[PDB]
Design an enzyme around this catalytic site. Structure first.
Site, PDB file in Angstrom:
ATOM      1  N   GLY A 136       0.801  -1.208   0.000  1.00 21.69           N
ATOM      2  CA  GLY A 136       0.000   0.000   0.000  1.00 21.69           C
ATOM      3  C   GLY A 136       0.837   1.261   0.000  1.00 21.69           C
ATOM      4  O   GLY A 136       1.740   1.416   0.827  1.00 21.69           O
ATOM      5  N   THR A 168      -0.120   4.410   0.718  1.00 20.86           N
ATOM      6  CA  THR A 168      -0.378   5.191   1.923  1.00 20.86           C
ATOM      7  C   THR A 168       0.270   4.540   3.139  1.00 20.86           C
ATOM      8  O   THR A 168       1.089   5.155   3.831  1.00 20.86           O
ATOM      9  CB  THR A 168      -1.886   5.343   2.134  1.00 20.86           C
ATOM     10  OG1 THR A 168      -2.474   5.963   0.982  1.00 20.86           O
ATOM     11  CG2 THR A 168      -2.175   6.189   3.366  1.00 20.86           C
ATOM     12  N   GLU A 184       4.118  -1.556  -6.653  1.00 21.83           N
ATOM     13  CA  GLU A 184       4.366  -2.184  -5.328  1.00 21.83           C
ATOM     14  C   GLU A 184       5.876  -2.268  -5.067  1.00 21.83           C
ATOM     15  O   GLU A 184       6.267  -2.006  -3.921  1.00 21.83           O
ATOM     16  CB  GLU A 184       3.723  -3.570  -5.257  1.00 21.83           C
ATOM     17  CG  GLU A 184       2.263  -3.532  -4.844  1.00 21.83           C
ATOM     18  CD  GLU A 184       1.592  -4.890  -4.718  1.00 21.83           C
ATOM     19  OE1 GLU A 184       2.253  -5.906  -5.012  1.00 21.83           O
ATOM     20  OE2 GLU A 184       0.410  -4.926  -4.323  1.00 21.83           O
ATOM     21  N   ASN A 204       2.526 -12.716   1.645  1.00 21.80           N
ATOM     22  CA  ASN A 204       1.105 -12.952   1.273  1.00 21.80           C
ATOM     23  C   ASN A 204       0.984 -14.352   0.673  1.00 21.80           C
ATOM     24  O   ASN A 204      -0.100 -14.946   0.802  1.00 21.80           O
ATOM     25  CB  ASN A 204       0.578 -11.884   0.311  1.00 21.80           C
ATOM     26  CG  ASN A 204       0.072 -10.643   1.015  1.00 21.80           C
ATOM     27  OD1 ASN A 204       0.184 -10.522   2.232  1.00 21.80           O
ATOM     28  ND2 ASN A 204      -0.492  -9.719   0.255  1.00 21.80           N
ATOM     29  N   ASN A 245      -6.451 -12.409   7.913  1.00 24.76           N
ATOM     30  CA  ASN A 245      -6.309 -11.479   9.065  1.00 24.76           C
ATOM     31  C   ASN A 245      -6.598 -12.247  10.354  1.00 24.76           C
ATOM     32  O   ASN A 245      -5.949 -11.935  11.375  1.00 24.76           O
ATOM     33  CB  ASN A 245      -7.205 -10.248   8.902  1.00 24.76           C
ATOM     34  CG  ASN A 245      -6.676  -9.268   7.875  1.00 24.76           C
ATOM     35  OD1 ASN A 245      -5.467  -9.133   7.706  1.00 24.76           O
ATOM     36  ND2 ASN A 245      -7.572  -8.573   7.192  1.00 24.76           N
ATOM     37  N   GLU A 256      13.848  -5.523  25.155  1.00 26.90           N
ATOM     38  CA  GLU A 256      14.414  -6.868  25.160  1.00 26.90           C
ATOM     39  C   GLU A 256      14.392  -7.492  23.770  1.00 26.90           C
ATOM     40  O   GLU A 256      15.200  -8.382  23.480  1.00 26.90           O
ATOM     41  CB  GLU A 256      13.654  -7.753  26.147  1.00 26.90           C
ATOM     42  CG  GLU A 256      13.832  -7.349  27.603  1.00 26.90           C
ATOM     43  CD  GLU A 256      13.241  -8.359  28.566  1.00 26.90           C
ATOM     44  OE1 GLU A 256      12.970  -9.502  28.140  1.00 26.90           O
ATOM     45  OE2 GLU A 256      13.048  -8.011  29.750  1.00 26.90           O
TER      46      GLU A 256
HETATM   47  N1  LIG Z   1      -2.586  -9.246   4.693  1.00 32.60           N
HETATM   48  C1  LIG Z   1      -3.254  -8.222   4.153  1.00 32.60           C
HETATM   49  N2  LIG Z   1      -2.775  -7.602   3.074  1.00 32.60           N
HETATM   50  C2  LIG Z   1      -3.579  -6.590   2.663  1.00 32.60           C
HETATM   51  C3  LIG Z   1      -4.763  -6.182   3.224  1.00 32.60           C
HETATM   52  N3  LIG Z   1      -5.291  -5.117   2.517  1.00 32.60           N
HETATM   53  C4  LIG Z   1      -4.436  -4.909   1.551  1.00 32.60           C
HETATM   54  N4  LIG Z   1      -3.378  -5.769   1.575  1.00 32.60           N
HETATM   55  C5  LIG Z   1      -2.255  -5.784   0.650  1.00 32.60           C
HETATM   56  O1  LIG Z   1      -1.558  -4.573   0.809  1.00 32.60           O
HETATM   57  C6  LIG Z   1      -1.257  -3.991  -0.478  1.00 32.60           C
HETATM   58  C7  LIG Z   1      -2.158  -2.798  -0.676  1.00 32.60           C
HETATM   59  O2  LIG Z   1      -2.146  -2.003   0.536  1.00 32.60           O
HETATM   60  P1  LIG Z   1      -3.433  -1.182   0.988  1.00 32.60           P
HETATM   61  O3  LIG Z   1      -3.575  -1.271   2.460  1.00 32.60           O
HETATM   62  O4  LIG Z   1      -4.591  -1.548   0.130  1.00 32.60           O
HETATM   63  O5  LIG Z   1      -2.962   0.294   0.633  1.00 32.60           O
HETATM   64  P2  LIG Z   1      -3.260   1.625   1.454  1.00 32.60           P
HETATM   65  O6  LIG Z   1      -2.365   1.667   2.601  1.00 32.60           O
HETATM   66  O7  LIG Z   1      -4.723   1.630   1.701  1.00 32.60           O
HETATM   67  O8  LIG Z   1      -2.867   2.801   0.423  1.00 32.60           O
HETATM   68  P3  LIG Z   1      -3.335   3.225  -1.076  1.00 32.60           P
HETATM   69  O9  LIG Z   1      -2.178   2.892  -1.971  1.00 32.60           O
HETATM   70  O10 LIG Z   1      -3.658   4.652  -1.110  1.00 32.60           O
HETATM   71  O11 LIG Z   1      -4.531   2.376  -1.364  1.00 32.60           O
HETATM   72  C8  LIG Z   1      -1.441  -5.154  -1.452  1.00 32.60           C
HETATM   73  O12 LIG Z   1      -0.276  -5.968  -1.491  1.00 32.60           O
HETATM   74  C9  LIG Z   1      -2.636  -5.867  -0.821  1.00 32.60           C
HETATM   75  O13 LIG Z   1      -2.783  -7.200  -1.257  1.00 32.60           O
HETATM   76  C10 LIG Z   1      -5.246  -6.832   4.377  1.00 32.60           C
HETATM   77  O14 LIG Z   1      -6.278  -6.595   5.007  1.00 32.60           O
HETATM   78  N5  LIG Z   1      -4.416  -7.864   4.772  1.00 32.60           N
END
Ligand SMILES: Nc1nc2c(ncn2[C@@H]2O[C@H](COP(=O)(O)OP(=O)(O)OP(=O)(O)O)[C@@H](O)[C@H]2O)c(=O)[nH]1
Ligand SMILES: Nc1nc2c(ncn2[C@@H]2O[C@H](COP(=O)(O)OP(=O)(O)OP(=O)(O)O)[C@@H](O)[C@H]2O)c(=O)[nH]1
Ligand SMILES: [Mg+2]
Ligand SMILES: [Mg+2]
Lengths: 438, 398, 431
Positions: free
Chosen positions: A143, A145, A183, A206, A228, A254
């Site tokens: 992500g 953000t 990514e 993942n 999750n 620690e």
């Molecule tokens: N394990 C896990 N991975 C997640 C989840 N949501 C998104 N991802 C992964 O995280 C990445 C995307 O991150 P997001 O959390 O969607 O991004 P963001 O932080 O919302 O930021 P933006 O880029 O603005 O959407 C990808 O690799 C997704 O497959 C989640 O609930 N669990």
């Protein structure tokens, strides 16, 4: 005692914190509205759950968490969820514009008009705590953000809260569950910007968790919800060291001395066993030896790697539930007689084992069954470096044609940051191999 | 008024924290200094007549002020570097009393650091910094770095060339791209005796190897610097280490003829075309240089090969490159002052490409190019290479 | 709630915008009065992206119409849907730019550019969070050609964090006989490259040939071309107005479809091809639509998608087709061993599936790709730009207003560099 604050960031981060808090409430018995009928005090100071939760005069338990998101799509559902009366409205912060899978945004474009307010909210919780240990960050490299805003907050805090620990629980992106084509850039940027802002950091492949949910739990298409719930078990097993009155890794400091020998290297591999489904609850009864031996299985590991082809610097085992040292001795002897693993002679740390008298817990009607015992193995091995090698392949190929690079430089970024971030990655990869020299 | 009332105000404005204020003040100090120098040059008077020594001390402390505050960082670092480059160029072009001072060492260190860190600068303003730093270095190396007429300080000659040759083997492709032109822009008196080493170091970069596959920008600058050195040194018989002569012209032509066959296809596309562009002009300005001194050095086989290669390069599906190829071909064919020797079918080529069909015909447009290029097939020499070049256009993608 | 500000300039731009708004209103179920009368809840979950919710449950458009000439303004004000556009969102003069780019960008179109900024800024103040501006004009003329460039250059300075998308309509000698069109197109493209993130090219020669051959119309008028342009516009903006799994915003779409900064011109299309009046005749399927989306005849530009590389591919399906049925079809056309396999339908293509079908059709499809063949659209104008530049014909008009040969040669060099980069990228290794 000492309190702790969990700062969740991104979609993945906010989705993982809710499940973790639900699991904690189901374990400690905290009701949805925040009422502990077993507690015999109104305020915190003598109990053991005060490290994570906060007590008040009205008996309300406000979890010590600071949820911050840019897109309100998830925060709107998290607010109106089953635990609407648990989290405080001030702790949940929402934005007005999404980064749209961009790091130069989550850091400079959308991270500048939200950081001035996140600090004011974090100070309200920091002033209430008499002795804060550090911070528990929860985000993901994929992500934009969750990476940019998290790195900005981390360094912003490095100035103010300098004498405080720092933890992380990132989620390594996978090609299958990929939301952005950039990514690799965001990940290599956030790993270089906060390589000095994290005392310890946990990576979640993942692919590994997906394979575990598809094989062990026996699920056709494990959704984010199922991934999750499975990570919540490991998070609880890791935090039990500080939540309960244990004797191993009770403080965040620690962790930097018993798992992170080198300040630069802070990516210890983690594994948890067993992984039984709900249908096969009372099917088989695996003793401590079986669950301890299963930890050395690449399929059960949280990250796809090969620890067999690498040395070991630090190792920490944590048992939970019905476990006796007499039985743990059998597994300790089997690890040496049957299995065999080398160790770095230049490493100060070694092997550590601990037990906690707290049985596990599962959500009603969940995927995992209420097992009788659990084991968590944290081993810092150089094999994890392989996970960083493939990540550098994709990034390198993409930056060979400089694709999607103009979108970052035109958002408060320089062309030299990419070269710096991959020069840092190369140095880290070289040090990973130099540490494992014969 | 500009020397007693305005220059002091531009000397103090440089201490302004404003970023747009410092660039403007530096540009004004450079322009007014150049104007005063040009004015003094009329009465063969020194430059210190208009500007006092107090103002002169500002021109020396401007570099120290920028180096202390570390203003060469962030987004404004590139702008500050570009401004200081133009300032140093205008100061060296005016013959200031700065020779033998730490200011020259500071300017040289800044130029080296700018030519050392080029990948950090954005691509939207890299060519400007590359063409300004080399010009400033040449002006400095052609003004301050001299011991006597026809010679230079050996202490600087034994170190600058050594460091540059140790900088032309830098893995980073942008380092070589900036150092090749800097080494090639040096004057002729600073190449006396060390010409063979510079030529060998520049040719070592033009050679392709397993590691340098996608290094096209570096090879382009390698040929550009060689062409610049050849144009600067000129021609002089009985002096292979001072200028170009019949003892090393063959080795130079071999390096120019070898880069034309580069047809690399990286992920970006047909990047090799770039390496060919500088490989064409380098083969033009050179062929004319000898024609203006010792035309007998140009061999017949080499001239025929160059002509056939230019003909092949003037019949490629590409439009921007084919236009430049046709322009170079016309400039080489029409050159008759003196006429260039070893021109295959010179009468037929002149009849098929008259002088009037040079500026009126648009080579960039295939319609106004292919009808005139296909006629070359009638000649024997212009048949194999021309057909090989036209096959790419007769079966491409466009 | 991401809002988008739509702007229209020039006669052709306004004529295209009016038709596009009418189409997207008839598809959403909005009577010409202003109220809502559709029969689907999906027509309101994203109506705020292009409609402001005023008092009384009314939906006010966000189309800012500007035109120096008081012609198309009155026509749109008294149109089938003229009563929808806010009345103070119309900004006009009296005399236009007289087919001169140096008039509608320096002496005339810069006289109403200040009133345009006030209007577009008063319209954006009510929005909660603006995403990116939009413009619909034609490269031919002065008020479409110069005014659009002036506005794009003036808005980028005050809103650098906003996306800039346009819908340039390249003219053609067949539609117009004006001779001062090559210069206006070159000067417009010069500014639409350094201050634009995305540009949808809709060549007029392509639509003319389509109406001449496909539709078999007698004398293709401007209405026939405007209908196809509005259909393509409605088919392109399907994800930004309806739900779906592929929730690609404007910035995300521009980042995923435009890897390079300078290269950003697409080749939009739409199928099946229809005309005015009747339409219901034959019902198409998913295979037929996929076979026709990727045909050079269904494209709205005079370019062959097959002849040239494929930077980024994307497709949007509209009707009762499922993303599962579409994936099955998109995974057998990128395979040679598979039967009825195509060589011009590339791999890693973006694909969408919509519920609400278009007007007068149950199933349709839209293509939004970026192929190197678009270079042909830039070379056709280059030749016509050089033959007229050597003789310095009609150059006094430009030199008198303030322009000079410097801008002309700069635009020529920029176009040449763009064509060279396109030709270089056309020959790239696939793997
Ligand atoms: N394990 C896990 N991975 C997640 C989840 N949501 C998104 N991802 C992964 O995280 C990445 C995307 O991150 P997001 O959390 O969607 O991004 P963001 O932080 O919302 O930021 P933006 O880029 O603005 O959407 C990808 O690799 C997704 O497959 C989640 O609930 N669990
Ligand atoms: N497709 C299409 N092209 C049009 C239309 N109107 C004009 N054009 C074309 O656009 C060019 C003329 O530009 P206009 O939009 O009429 O001019 P303007 O922008 O109002 O500028 P001025 O002439 O300066 O007032 C010619 O190439 C026309 O063929 C239209 O409704 N549809
Ligand atoms: Mg998100
Ligand atoms: Mg008009």
């Amino acid at each position: 005692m000492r309190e702790c604050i969990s700062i969740h960031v991104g979609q993945a981060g906010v989705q993982i914190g809710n499940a973790c808090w639900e699991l904690y409430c189901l374990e400690h018995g905290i009701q949805p509205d925040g009422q502990m009928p077993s507690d015999k005090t109104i305020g915190g100071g003598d109990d053991s759950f005060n490290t994570f939760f906060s007590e008040t005069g009205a008996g309300k338990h406000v979890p010590r968490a600071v949820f911050v998101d840019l897109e309100p799509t998830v925060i709107d559902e998290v607010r109106t969820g089953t635990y609407r009366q648990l989290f405080h409205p001030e702790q949940l912060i929402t934005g007005k514009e999404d980064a749209a899978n961009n790091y130069a945004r989550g850091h400079y474009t959308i991270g500048k008009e939200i950081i001035d307010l996140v600090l004011d909210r974090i100070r309200k919780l920091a002033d209430q705590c008499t002795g804060l240990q550090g911070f528990l960050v929860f985000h993901s490299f994929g992500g934009g953000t969750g990476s940019g805003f998290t790195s900005l907050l981390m360094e912003r805090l490095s100035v103010d809260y300098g004498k405080k620990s720092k933890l992380e629980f990132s989620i390594y992106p996978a090609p299958q569950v990929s939301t952005a084509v950039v990514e690799p850039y965001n990940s290599i940027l956030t790993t270089h910007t906060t390589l000095e802002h994290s005392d310890c950091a946990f990576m979640v492949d993942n692919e590994a968790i997906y394979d575990i949910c598809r094989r062990n739990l026996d699920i056709e298409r494990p959704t984010y919800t199922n991934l999750n719930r499975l990570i919540s078990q490991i998070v609880s097993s890791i935090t039990a060291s500080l939540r309960f009155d244990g004797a191993l890794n009770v403080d965040l400091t620690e962790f930097q001395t018993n798992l992170v020998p080198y300040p630069r290297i802070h990516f210890p591999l983690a594994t948890y066993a067993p992984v039984i489904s709900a249908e096969k609850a009372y099917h088989e009864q695996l003793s401590v030896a079986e669950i301890t031996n299963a930890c050395f299985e690449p399929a059960n590991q949280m990250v796809k790697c090969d620890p067999r082809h690498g040395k070991y610097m630090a190792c920490c085992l944590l048992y939970r539930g019905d476990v006796v040292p007499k039985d743990v001795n059998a597994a300790i002897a089997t690890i040496k007689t049957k299995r065999s693993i080398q160790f770095v002679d230049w490493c100060p740390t070694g092997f550590k084992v601990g037990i906690n008298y707290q049985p596990p817990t599962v959500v009603p009607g969940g995927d995992l069954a209420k097992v009788q015992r659990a084991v968590c193995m944290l081993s810092n091995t150089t094999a994890i470096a392989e996970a960083w090698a493939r990540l550098d392949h994709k990034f390198d190929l993409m930056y060979a044609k400089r694709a999607f690079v103009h979108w970052y430089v035109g958002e408060g970024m320089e062309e030299g940051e990419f070269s710096e971030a991959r020069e840092d990655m190369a140095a880290l990869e070289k040090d990973y191999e130099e540490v494992g020299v014969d | 008024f500009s020397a007693t009332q305005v220059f002091p105000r531009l000397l103090s404005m440089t201490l302004s924290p404003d970023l747009h204020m410092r660039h403007g003040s530096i540009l004004a100090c450079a322009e007014v200094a150049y104007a005063l120098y040009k004015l003094a040059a009329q009465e063969n008077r020194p430059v210190t007549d208009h500007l006092d020594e107090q103002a002169v001390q500002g021109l020396k402390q401007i570099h120290q002020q920028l180096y202390d505050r570390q203003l060469y960082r962030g987004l404004g670092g590139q702008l500050m570097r570009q401004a200081v480059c133009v300032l140093i160029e205008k100061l060296s072009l005016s013959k200031m009393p700065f020779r033998g001072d730490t200011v020259i060492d500071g300017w040289q260190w800044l130029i080296n650091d700018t030519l050392r860190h080029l990948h950090l600068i954005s691509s939207h303003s890299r060519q400007q910094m590359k063409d300004a730093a080399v010009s400033a270095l040449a002006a400095l190396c052609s003004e301050y770095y001299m011991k006597e007429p026809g010679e230079a300080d050996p202490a600087i000659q034994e170190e600058l060339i050594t460091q540059y040759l140790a900088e032309l083997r830098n893995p980073e492709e942008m380092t070589r791209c900036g150092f090749s032109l800097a080494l090639g822009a040096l004057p002729g008196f600073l190449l006396k005796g060390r010409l063979q080493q510079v030529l060998t170091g520049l040719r070592a970069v033009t050679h392709t190897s397993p590691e340098d596959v996608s290094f096209a920008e570096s090879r382009r600058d390698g040929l550009k610097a060689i062409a610049r050195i050849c144009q600067t040194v000129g021609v002089k018989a009985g002096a292979p280490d001072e200028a170009v002569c019949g003892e090393n012209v063959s080795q130079i032509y071999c390096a120019l003829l070898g880069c034309m066959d580069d047809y690399t296809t990286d992920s970006r596309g047909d990047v090799g075309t770039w390496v060919r562009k500088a490989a064409m002009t380098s083969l033009m300005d050179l062929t004319l240089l000898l024609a203006r001194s010792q035309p007998e050095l140009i061999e017949a086989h080499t001239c025929e090969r160059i002509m056939c290669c230019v003909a092949q390069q003037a019949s490629e599906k590409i439009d921007r490159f084919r236009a430049h190829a046709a322009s170079v071909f016309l400039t080489l064919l029409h050159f008759d002052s003196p006429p260039i020797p070893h021109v295959p079918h010179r009468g037929e080529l002149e009849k098929l490409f008259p002088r009037s069909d040079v500026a009126s015909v648009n080579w960039s447009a295939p319609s106004q190019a292919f009808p005139r290029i296909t006629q070359l097939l009638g000649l024997p020499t212009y048949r194999y290479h021309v057909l090989l070049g036209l096959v790419v256009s007769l079966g491409g993608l466009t | 709630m991401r809002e988008i500000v739509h702007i229209q300039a020039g006669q052709c731009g306004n004529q295209i915008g009016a038709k596009f708004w009418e189409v997207i209103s008839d598809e959403h179920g909005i009577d010409p009065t202003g109220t809502y009368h559709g029969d689907s809840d999906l027509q309101l979950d994203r109506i705020s992206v292009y409609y402001n919710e005023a008092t009384g449950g009314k939906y006010v458009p966000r189309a800012i119409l500007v035109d120096l000439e008081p012609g198309t303004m009155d026509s749109v004000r008294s149109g089938p849907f003229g009563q929808i556009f806010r009345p103070d969102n119309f900004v006009f003069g009296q005399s236009g730019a007289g087919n001169n780019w140096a008039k509608g960008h320096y002496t005339e179109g810069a006289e109403l550019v200040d009133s345009v900024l006030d209007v577009v800024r008063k319209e954006a103040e009510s929005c909660d969070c603006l995403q990116g501006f939009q413009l619909t004009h034609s490269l031919g003329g002065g008020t479409g050609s110069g005014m659009g460039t002036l506005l794009i250059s003036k808005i980028r300075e005050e809103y650098p964090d906003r996306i800039m998308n346009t819908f340039s309509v390249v003219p053609s000698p067949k539609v117009s006989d004006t001779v001062v069109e090559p210069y206006n197109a070159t000067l417009s493209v010069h500014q639409l490259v350094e201050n634009t993130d995305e540009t949808y090219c809709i060549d007029n020669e392509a639509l003319y040939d389509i109406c001449f051959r496909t539709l078999k119309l007698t004398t293709p008028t401007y209405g026939d071309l405007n209908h196809l342009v509005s259909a393509t516009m409605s088919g392109v903006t399907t994800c930004l107005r309806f739900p779906g799994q592929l929730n690609a915003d404007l910035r995300k779409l521009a980042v995923n479809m435009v890897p390079f900064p300078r290269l950003h011109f697409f080749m939009p299309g739409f199928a099946p091809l229809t005309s005015r009046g009747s339409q219901q005749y034959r019902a198409l399927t998913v295979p037929e639509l996929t076979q026709q989306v990727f045909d050079a005849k269904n494209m709205m530009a005079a370019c062959d998608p097959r002849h040239g590389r494929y930077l980024t591919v994307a497709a949007v399906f509209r009707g009762r087709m499922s993303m599962k049925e579409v994936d099955e079809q998109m995974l057998n056309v990128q395979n040679k061993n598979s039967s009825y396999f195509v060589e011009w339908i590339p791999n890693n293509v973006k694909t969408a599936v919509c519920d609400i079908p278009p007007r007068g059709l149950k199933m349709a499809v839209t293509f939004i790709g970026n192929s190197t063949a678009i270079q042909e659209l830039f070379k056709r104008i280059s030749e016509q730009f050089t033959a007229m530049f050597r003789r310095k014909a009609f150059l006094h008009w430009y030199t008198g207003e303030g322009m000079d040969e410097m801008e002309f040669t700069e635009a020529e060099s920029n176009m040449n560099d763009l064509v060279s980069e396109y030709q270089q990228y056309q020959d790239a290794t696939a793997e």
